[PDB]
Write a protein that binds this ligand. Structure first.
Ligand code: HEM
Ligand code: HEM
Ligand SMILES: C[C@H](O)[C@H](O)[C@H]1CNc2nc(N)[nH]c(=O)c2N1
Ligand SMILES: C[C@H](O)[C@H](O)[C@H]1CNc2nc(N)[nH]c(=O)c2N1
Ligand SMILES: C=CC/[NH+]=C(/N)NCCC[C@H](N)C(=O)O
Ligand SMILES: C=CC/[NH+]=C(/N)NCCC[C@H](N)C(=O)O
Ligand SMILES: [Zn+2]
Lengths: 407, 410
């Protein structure tokens, strides 16, 4: 099978054959596309394991070898008597780097292979989980020069001894809903912040309060911990020309670390696998700062810019939005903290994508997510057609822990 | 069957039941999504069900489903197809279909105006000159001295596919593109090929930067012909900035009437290969794509340079900065000349409203997110945060091969 993909800005056409190895569903059918929808056992386990192992050995150029077969049999036997199996270190690294390589919503996959993997499978407690996480945060932050990483905790067994990190990200500001009706801090975390207070945390009720980690180990009740403040690198936001900007009182954290997702390798599930890399400007300046549902800072910034906010046709929101992002990129670069803008990031992804086609025969990509939330059509990925499909190993969403935990 | 669509900025949830009446394919499977792909002679036995389908709709809409009138027509059409292999739509039905083809345009963010559409029955047309007259009347009614009106002119429906009527230009009004030996491209790159066909056909290009192309009309399947739209009929707008008095010196202007002319309109199985339609522009179309697309007028460098911004490193966002101003200029100029135009903020907000309405009244509103969301400031418009369901419903506007790649010259 061959599927064509054209870039209408360079006319370059690529052929996709990788989609043939697609396994899971998309949510779409022949009668309806759901492209813009946020989120649509022993016998089960062995095929998946086999599939994975074949992939691995095929990648190392030992497909069929005795080694291959031995492992193939070893795993089989193991699943036969234990109802599961453990991944050799090498396969875990591959498994992880590849779940990334397949993240159809990640624009920065050009860096997929350069990933630091921390095997946290020997962990057994929340305190243990806390030591690991602290080590991960430190390695990755690296004094401003970020490095990609992921710490993987014990894999699921019976689902009743699940390891979970209740935060959505290792680092995020608390959200407090006032009687006033408004919301202080990050609206997006209002619920979680509540659960922290409810568990004991003592909220400083500030605008940018670094939430506490709520770690759950072996299925037991989650415990709270405070990331060592000296480990949380933050950048104060200032404009390269608006000296009044700094008076906005804006700051953000430099380490983006998604922690609420689930990593699947060879049929195995890792309900706790925090991973970090680095930010693309717009993430903070466009979505976090300007989304109506977040810090919603357009009004202010505009006012302080003295623009005709009387009529929408003045594009005051557009003018402000560009300035707010200049500031973000400016700040980070000035404090020498890693960060990439939407122009570089997207250009990169195009090269990567081009490489992925020649080397792998494709690159699953979710356009709705790859294209930045600003200046869309002036980034090359806008004019780039993309095919979306799911490949394992993979990163998946999973129910919020509080909505499923048997206390 | 019920499908839920959520808006993550308001938490509003809508239920789609209209997708159930979806007919055609999307290009998507359960295994692969092609949402971001540009574009993934009927028999007589195929025709009737379609006609029946259509007629049932039409009548169900006027609250006359099953009536005698309903049945007679159903029988009348069946009989006609039986003896002629096709069938003429009654005036009332043609209007219904056109309005609904637009109503179903999943890629249209301006569908809130779907019902307010002027239909021009050009089915009695028979020659290129004839089409020329018709198109002039359409341009004039539509422009309306600057206060634009939606309209569509419908020419003879296809029959044997050898007597097709076609409008070769993609939009009734468009600037010519000329490729120079230099390697560069003068005017609109997007039209280079079509411009050539025009010159090759007899047109005498002024070889300027904003030359209004000539119409190339094909009637009854005969070779296309040339015509110049009456200048006094082509309303144009010179672009200038509300604060940059050096802007005007950029030498930019654009036509006020956006009028697509290369699509095909399907009503009750019948195919209309020539059905030019026009409405009005959303700023970003000109301001972002036509001016700033790399493969278009590519004016970012200039606007940036004259704005004197740091173009050394991308992280200074000079492009983002220049673009906004350029869009400011387009909206400004158009408002100054009292030429209808809408900004991406107003248009998208309206669409959300129209979309919600459509769910309550119709039970869905097929929409292509990849196309609805503006090419700039994407997330600060409501539609970005809006989930959408894409599916095809007829009547409809479809794409069709370029006529120069299919015509059997005489
Ligand atoms: C090197 C720096 C990286 C950059 C610049 C980058 C950039 C992005 C961006 C812009 C998003 C969308 C974020 C959002 O809108 O919420 C994203 C999502 C994603 N990235 Fe990357 N990424 C990087 C590293 C990583 C790493 C290290 C992994 C995996 C090991 C990865 C996995 C993902 C996943 C799972 C998603 C989708 C999350 C979701 O569905 O919400 N990324 N990335
Ligand atoms: C009232 C003014 C209107 C506005 C502001 C509006 C706006 C839009 C915009 C912004 C696009 C995308 C353009 C592009 O990116 O190339 C579009 C596409 C579309 N609109 Fe509208 N529209 C209007 C009137 C109409 C009318 C009157 C019809 C039909 C009678 C219609 C049918 C469609 C169709 C068929 C498409 C997709 C065309 C394609 O696939 O290339 N629109 N509209
Ligand atoms: C409704 C729509 O799916 C939603 O707004 C999506 C669109 N694209 C996105 N793209 C990225 N990168 N991140 C997001 O959170 C979203 N939100
Ligand atoms: C490749 C991708 O499908 C293509 O660039 C699409 C995206 N969205 C669009 N949206 C609109 N309105 N118009 C376009 O031409 C496009 N181009
Ligand atoms: C964990 C590394 C992924 N890299 C990222 N740049 N972002 C992940 C999501 C971050 C989220 N969009 C935010 O603004 O906080
Ligand atoms: C014909 C009416 C459709 N309404 C529109 N606003 N646009 C149609 C496409 C015009 C195209 N985007 C352009 O810039 O030339
Ligand atoms: Zn799809």
């Amino acid at each position: 099978r061959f599927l064509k993909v054209k870039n209408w800005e360079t006319d370059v056409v690529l052929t996709d054959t990788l989609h043939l190895k697609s396994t899971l569903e998309t949510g779409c059918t022949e009668h309806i596309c759901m492209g813009s929808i946020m989120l649509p056992t022993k016998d089960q386990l062995f095929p998946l394991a086999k599939e994975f192992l074949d992939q691995y050995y095929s990648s190392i150029k030992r497909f069929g070898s005795k080694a291959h077969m031995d492992r193939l049999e070893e795993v089989n036997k193991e699943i036969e008597s234990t109802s599961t199996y453990q991944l050799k270190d090498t396969e875990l690294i591959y498994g992880a780097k590849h779940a990334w390589r397949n993240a159809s919503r990640c624009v920065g996959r050009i860096q997929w292979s350069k990933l630091q993997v921390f095997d946290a499978r020997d962990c057994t407690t929340a305190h243990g989980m806390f030591n690991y996480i602290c080590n991960h945060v430190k390695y990755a932050t690296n004094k401003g020069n970020l490095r990609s990483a992921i710490t993987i905790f014990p894999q699921r067994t019976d689902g009743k001894h699940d390891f979970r990190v209740w935060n959505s990200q290792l680092i995020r500001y608390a959200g407090y809903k006032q009687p006033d009706g408004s919301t202080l801090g990050d609206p997006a975390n209002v619920q979680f912040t509540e659960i922290c207070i409810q568990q004991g945390w003592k909220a400083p009720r500030g605008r940018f309060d670094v939430l506490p980690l709520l770690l759950q180990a072996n299925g037991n009740d989650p415990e709270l911990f405070q990331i060592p403040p000296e480990l949380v690198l933050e950048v104060p936001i200032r404009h390269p020309k608006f000296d009044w900007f700094k008076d906005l009182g804006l700051k953000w954290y430099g380490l983006p670390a998604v922690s609420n997702m689930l990593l699947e390798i060879g049929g195995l599930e890792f309900s706790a696998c925090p991973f970090s890399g680095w930010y693309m400007g717009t993430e903070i300046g466009v979505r976090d700062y300007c989304d109506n549902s977040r810090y919603n800072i357009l009004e202010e910034v505009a006012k302080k810019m003295d623009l005709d906010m009387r009529k929408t046709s003045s594009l005051w929101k557009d003018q402000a939005l560009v300035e707010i992002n200049i500031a973000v990129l400016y700040s980070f670069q000035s404090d020498k903290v890693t960060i990439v803008d939407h122009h570089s990031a997207t250009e990169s992804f195009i090269k990567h994508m081009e490489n992925e086609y020649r080397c792998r025969g494709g690159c699953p990509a979710d356009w709705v997510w790859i294209v930045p939330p600003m200046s869309g059509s002036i980034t090359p990925v806008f004019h780039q057609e993309m095919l979306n499909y799911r490949l394992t190993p993979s990163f998946e969403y999973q129910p919020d822990p509080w909505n499923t935990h048997v206390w």
